[PDB]
From Swiss-Prot, chain A:
The gene is UBE2E2. Pathway: Protein modification; protein ubiquitination. One of its GO terms (cellular component) is nucleus. Belongs to the ubiquitin-conjugating enzyme family. It catalyses: S-ubiquitinyl-[E1 ubiquitin-activating enzyme]-L-cysteine + [E2 ubiquitin-conjugating enzyme]-L-cysteine = [E1 ubiquitin-activating enzyme]-L-cysteine + S-ubiquitinyl-[E2 ubiquitin-conjugating enzyme]-L-cysteine. The chain holds residues 54 to 201 of 201 of the full protein. Residues 2-148 form the UBC core domain. Autoubiquitinated in vitro. One of its GO terms (molecular function) is ubiquitin-protein transferase activity. GO terms for biological process: DNA damage response; ISG15-protein conjugation; positive regulation of G1/S transition of mitotic cell cycle; protein K11-linked ubiquitination; protein K48-linked ubiquitination; protein K63-linked ubiquitination; protein monoubiquitination. This is Ubiquitin-conjugating enzyme E2 E2. It comes from Homo sapiens. Its EC number is 2.3.2.23.
Curated annotation (Swiss-Prot), chain B:
It is found in: Nucleus. GO terms for molecular function: protein-containing complex binding; ubiquitin protein ligase binding; ubiquitin-like ligase-substrate adaptor activity. InterPro entries: De-etiolated_protein_1_Det1. This is DET1 homolog. The gene is DET1. Belongs to the DET1 family. It comes from Homo sapiens.
UniProtKB/Swiss-Prot annotation, chain C:
The gene is DDB1. This is DNA damage-binding protein 1. The lineage of its organism: Eukaryota, Metazoa, Chordata, Craniata, Vertebrata. Keywords: Acetylation, Biological rhythms, Cytoplasm, Disease variant, DNA damage, DNA repair, DNA-binding, Host-virus interaction, Intellectual disability, Isopeptide bond, Nucleus, Phosphoprotein, Repeat, Ubl conjugation, Ubl conjugation pathway. The modification N-acetylserine is found at S2. The modification N6-acetyllysine is found at K755. It comes from the Eukaryota. InterPro entries: Beta-prop_RSE1/DDB1/CPSF1_1st, Cleavage/polyA-sp_fac_asu_C, RSE1/DDB1/CFT1/CPSF1, WD40/YVTN_repeat-like_dom_sf, WD40_repeat_dom_sf. One of its GO terms (molecular function) is cullin family protein binding. Residues 13-356 are annotated as: WD repeat beta-propeller A. It comes from Homo sapiens (Human). Phosphorylated by ABL1. Ubiquitinated by CUL4A. Subsequently degraded by ubiquitin-dependent proteolysis. One of its GO terms (biological process) is regulation of circadian rhythm.
UniProtKB/Swiss-Prot annotation, chain D:
Belongs to the DDA1 family. It comes from the Eukaryota. Functions as a component of numerous distinct DCX (DDB1-CUL4-X-box) E3 ubiquitin-protein ligase complexes which mediate the ubiquitination and subsequent proteasomal degradation of target proteins. In the DCX complexes, acts as a scaffolding subunit required to stabilize the complex. Component of numerous DCX (DDB1-CUL4-X-box) E3 ubiquitin-protein ligase complexes which consist of a core of DDB1, cullin-4 (CUL4A or CUL4B), DDA1 and RBX1. Component of the DCX(DCAF15) complex, also named CLR4(DCAF15) complex, composed of DCAF15, DDB1, cullin-4 (CUL4A or CUL4B), DDA1 and RBX1. Part of the DDD core complex containing DET1, DDA1 and DDB1; the DDD core complex recruits a specific UBE2E enzyme, such as UBE2E1, UBE2E2 UBE2E3, to form specific DDD-E2 complexes. The chain holds residues 3 to 69 of 102 of the full protein. This is DET1- and DDB1-associated protein 1.
Amino acid sequence: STSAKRIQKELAEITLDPPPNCSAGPKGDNIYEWRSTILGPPGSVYEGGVFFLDITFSPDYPFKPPKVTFRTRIYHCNINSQGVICLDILKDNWSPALTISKVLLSICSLLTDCNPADPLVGSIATQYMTNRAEHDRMARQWTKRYAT
Amino acid sequence: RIQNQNVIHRLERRRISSGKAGTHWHQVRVFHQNVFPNFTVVNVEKPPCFLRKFSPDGRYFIAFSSDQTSLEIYEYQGCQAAEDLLQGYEGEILSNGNDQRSVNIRGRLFERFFVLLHITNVAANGEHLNRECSLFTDDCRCVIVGSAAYLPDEPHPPFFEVYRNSESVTPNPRSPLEDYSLHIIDLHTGRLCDTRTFKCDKVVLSHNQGLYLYKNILAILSVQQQTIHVFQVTPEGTFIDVRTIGRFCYEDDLLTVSAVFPEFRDPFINSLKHRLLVYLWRRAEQDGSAMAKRRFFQYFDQLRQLRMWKMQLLDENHLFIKYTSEDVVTLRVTDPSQASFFVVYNMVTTEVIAVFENTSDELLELFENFCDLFRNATLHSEVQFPCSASSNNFARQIQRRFKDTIINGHTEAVRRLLGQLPISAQSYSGSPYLDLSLFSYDDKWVSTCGDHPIRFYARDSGLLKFEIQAGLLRLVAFTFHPFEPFAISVQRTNAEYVVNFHMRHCCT
Amino acid sequence: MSYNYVVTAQKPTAVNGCVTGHFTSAEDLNLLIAKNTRLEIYVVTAEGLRPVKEVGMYGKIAVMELFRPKGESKDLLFILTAKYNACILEYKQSGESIDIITRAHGNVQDRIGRPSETGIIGIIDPECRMIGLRLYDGLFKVIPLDRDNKELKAFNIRLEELHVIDVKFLYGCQAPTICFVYQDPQGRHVKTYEVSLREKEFNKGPWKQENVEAEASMVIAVPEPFGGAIIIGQESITYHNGDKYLAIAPPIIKQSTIVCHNRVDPNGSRYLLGDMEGRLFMLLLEKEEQMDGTVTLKDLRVELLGETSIAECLTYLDNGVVFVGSRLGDSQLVKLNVDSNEQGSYVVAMETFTNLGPIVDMCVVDLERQGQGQLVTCSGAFKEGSLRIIRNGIGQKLHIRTVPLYESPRKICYQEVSQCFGVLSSRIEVQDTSGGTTALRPSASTQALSSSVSSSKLFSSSTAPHETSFGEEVEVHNLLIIDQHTFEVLHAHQFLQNEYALSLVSCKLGKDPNTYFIVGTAMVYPEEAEPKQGRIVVFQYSDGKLQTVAEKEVKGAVYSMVEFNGKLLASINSTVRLYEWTTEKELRTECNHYNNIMALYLKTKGDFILVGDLMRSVLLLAYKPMEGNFEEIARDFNPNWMSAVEILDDDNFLGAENAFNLFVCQKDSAATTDEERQHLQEVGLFHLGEFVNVFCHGSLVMQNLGETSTPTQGSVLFGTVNGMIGLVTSLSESWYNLLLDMQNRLNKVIKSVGKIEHSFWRSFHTERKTEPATGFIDGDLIESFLDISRPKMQEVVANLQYDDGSGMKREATADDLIKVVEELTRIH
Amino acid sequence: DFLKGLPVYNKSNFSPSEQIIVTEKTNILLRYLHQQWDKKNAA
């Protein structure tokens, strides 16, 4: 299992250097089942709220992208009700060069702003450009009302 | 010993001095050392009903008929309505012998004290009233009872009906689901004030374990659905929905999502459970060490499956929930081996104020230093006279003796002393003859059978005052009147319903 | 349904607390006296104690302290009532107008909490930083004194020691500190805690745990430079300051118990003390000065000064004058003298203040046959016992004549034919080493013109003579015959050993024309929970001779007795019995009624019998002449602790509860089922604030002839433990509604001291229920309507329709209401 | 000897509620829990 051999080593560096606003950890000794704790990056409209992320590392890893699912209900411009985010880095475009450490920052940075070029819900895009005000106050409320 | 033990001294001293301000309450309470139930009657005949309890004000007595479908309301006539019959009888006992006189009173004693007023039938769809379920409102105007009806084996209930959340429990074979209903009945008239229904749950009506009333706020814990329903009791005795705690913490949570995402179908964890997860996370963040980080994620799965088991209201807006393993809550495993997490939650603000492990010494310090606030008994009297580890020195001493006895297991001691918590609503009686300040005895006899007669010793002098025996010269239940000198001792053997009345007789 | 009117005829006279300080101004010296609900302000001046202003509050004053925080020219007064209406008062005088301003006010009750046995305790930090309060066991309420903040956030503090007896604020400490004495299974201990306001807990004090005399019941905080505290017990006095410890056990102190104290010297060198027997002591704090300027305490000294009225509170005023406040006896104003008199007493009485209470029994009689009743009371206790002949009018309104007895009276009745008063009493004698008993002082019984002793052997030696330990007080009861003119003790019959006389009647029985004195007793033994024996003795007083006409043995204590249509009605423990006077001059049982817990009080009207129980409230009975037995007509199911009962009318029955509450039961005329007719409904509720001890039909005012249409019907007097004498009457529904409407209007005009709501003051309140007043009118409030300014009167009468007696209501006018109140105010 | 020289205040001795007291609404046990909670935010 290439995934287990590679990830074992990557645990020492990541735990020694927990990136800001993005952290995680293993479950027991297994690698195919992990959890992560993500914190709303400072200045984000979801800032403050803490989101638990379901992260699964497949044995086929790294030839397939990591499995990501949100276990916290978040109104995001990239994620649907099932908590799955589909970004090229999390798709076939994935490459073995990227590691479990980078994804958090890519996800963490992605939370700050939408990618309306390929959005998963069109209502935001109209609200995102026309009147973002409705999209923020309510976005503030959701994190304030759920993640708090 | 003060020479004031006689009633006369107390009566004369009361006519010249009312005492220091605020002491007059204890001026009268000492009379209970002069007036007590010194006389006992064995094996009194009674209707084929099930006796339940007195009302907090001690005016009404409730019993359940043998069909567990109607509530019997009896009015207490006083502990002085059977003195005419007993004239000429001496001693501390009255054997159920053969003399016609004793038979005449035994067949007449029960009706002398208790007068039938109403018999209200509430269950109408196969439901059966729970014998151990009973609650009285703060004003004492209304009583609350619950009826349960086992569901049929087939057809099996719908999956979307039996399971309404990701954290729902899996029903066990021995205790299949039931359809519950709660009724509020006015004691004065017997009218059925209002009734609410619950479908496909598992609520422990017995001993009010799944229920708790604080003033006018009522809480119901649905173990099957891991959901809490909160109702407000109006003066009329009509239920009003307050809010529901569970998958959502705010009453408007469903409304907002419905418009955006109209929708077991949702993998997001419960709003409440998320807050408990946040607290265990933020606390683990303070340590910073890899160990604390190591443990948090290692047991995340085990912790995420924790399920509610009990609850109780610390105030009108705080809940003291207890959490335990999914297996234990279904009565398959012993809890002590499983860590139980106590949680304090604010209903309006919606944050977890505190979380205490089972071995949390901080919680134990709170319990013994605030046992009065946890018990929340005798709430129906503005001037309460609580007896507990935090209200009487002698009550505290027993608490230390139990703990010291176990140590001479520190951890195991903490384990069992918290087994009673959370407490069941309206489980304690404000009987002055049970007050430790006035009288002395061993709390073990009344809260396996105690073969010895219970003896009550006055604390001022240490002298015996009266004895209580609940058998014919094996479960024993006592029911003291809230204040007056009257007590019922019921001895159960197989199917025998033995009743003895303890009342004050002026030995002539 | 029931409409009653309650008024006060004699304001309470007992003294609960006394404090002195600078209140009216920074230069004046003020004496403040609390008499239950009345606050009196006196100025210590050359001519005496000049009255300044007497203020009545809507509560039972339970705490009264004076303090002066920084930035205040004169001191401020803090008062807490028994209903927990805390307030802070300021004295303002504008010209001739004198006003009391409530700087702060608010209630501090905790709905959950066990009231402490020793009662309410109030303490103030010497620096005026906080206010402590010990209301409920296990809690110590605090009130920070932030001048700038508008919400004084009182907060409770957990207190580990549950049974706290006394607590005080120490002197000369950087942070607020409290010293207190508490009880526990190991005995009694004294401990200290430091109060930290911000953290809101107790911090370890500068002292250590200690074990002291089990009777330690009072703590005195010695001011600078001594510091420390003084602990007073039953047989010792000790001083604690850090490690410094002193002890004295003078034999003089043990003869009584110290119950009060007061500081004379600001340095704390000299301390006053009073005890139960009335003896006044002086505690001296001798100081040894070091060469380094450190003041160290040398030793204590206790020196008897003399005797005074049994003291409840002492307050040294100035120039050697001390004020002694007493509940059981008259309050004195004594002078301490440099040189003792021939008797070795330095105490000289200067003035005495009348104190009727505690009224224990009374009878309304017409000595002059002029229609003016002269109330005769059994006042006082112990050496202060006396008879007060309260006569209304002048010939201010109340004229009181005192007849000291030097022993506690218990009962009284008037026998017109013999022209004498029959009075019970009980002096105290100590068991001398000789085997008998010796009276402590000469009293009325020992100074009787003629004496007799009961000679009966109804009670054999079956009861063993218990340990007659030397020095143990014993009560000896006597029946005194007192002339109605000179009030001499014509005769004094003594009762058997350990026999207590509880009831007394003077009536004719049956066809017999002779009048008699009937006494019900009870053989009392200390170790017996209840009396199992008693007697009913019939005495006859003729030509100055007392004859024991007949006796009677009963199986209990004769709590009460009353003549019932030529037959004797007596209550024995839980029984109510009826006796007949046979031609052989003996008592014969007729009928019984055993359905009571304790039949303490009996009253009758016609064939109806009103029975007051110890805890089961009122019960109505009737006599069946044709059947000769009792029919229990109705009863009350509300468990009140009774202390007096009376029958206002055939339908209304009045009672008094232990918690200073009145209530009126009524017979259910709307009941259809036989069960519903067996319930007595409560139509009246009222918080009086006094422990009523007796009711007696009568009136001190001349009985108006021909005025049967007066606004009020009936008249019932009642005496309280505090010396209050009040009058109760029934009212027509039209008048009750008129005054009830007027009552609410007044509360919007008159500002109550402490901003306490009147409705809250009079609200029925017990341990079980708390309800607003119903069917009662506060006469005191109505009478105050006269003393307010005219424009204030006009405000009440606004938009109010009044009936001028023609059956219709017209626009009301103030002058019209003046006449209504004037009739009401003249009925007492 | 001990009664001499008693205090003398005068030789002629005898010849708009600016504040409100409000008890804390929260029960004492809760206050302990709340106050302990606020320390976590500071820590």
